[PDB]
């Protein structure tokens, strides 16, 4: 029974594995902005795709016009 | 017959002991910064175990 109040102490601390555990450090205010940043980012690459599909059709049209 | 003098090895007796316990000590006891590791050896990747 002990062995297991043990166990869920180990595995809730800090660095509990003596395997791969090192620190990271960070700052928030880059991260906020990355964040916010892949938001435009990503709508910008569908949009991008959708104008392509407009010009994709004009150049059709423009064909059918000229056919 | 030795025909000479004996044979000798030289060994500065103080010296070691000054050096040896000035290692067993703070040498051992520097920040990790200034520690290296060998080669062909293999350390685990956390900080604070010991080994």
């Known amino acids: 029974a002990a062995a297991a109040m043990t166990a869920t102490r180990l595995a809730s601390s800090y660095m509990p594995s003596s395997g791969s555990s090192p620190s990271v450090p960070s700052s928030i205010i880059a991260e906020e902005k990355l964040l916010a940043l892949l938001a435009e980012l990503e709508a910008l690459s569908r949009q ?7 010009v994709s059709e004009l150049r059709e049209q423009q064909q059918q016009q000229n056919k | 017959i ?10 500065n007796l103080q010296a ?7 290692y067993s000590n703070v040498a051992l006891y520097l920040p ?3 520690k290296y590791t060998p080669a062909n050896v293999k350390l685990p990747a956390n900080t604070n175990t010991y080994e």
């Open chain 1, 48 to 54: 991008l795709a959708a104008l392509t599909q407009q």
């Open chain 2, 2 to 11: 030795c025909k000479g003098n004996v044979y000798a090895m030289e060994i």
């Open chain 2, 16 to 22: 070691n002991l000054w050096k040896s316990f000035l």
């Open chain 2, 32 to 34: 990790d910064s200034y």
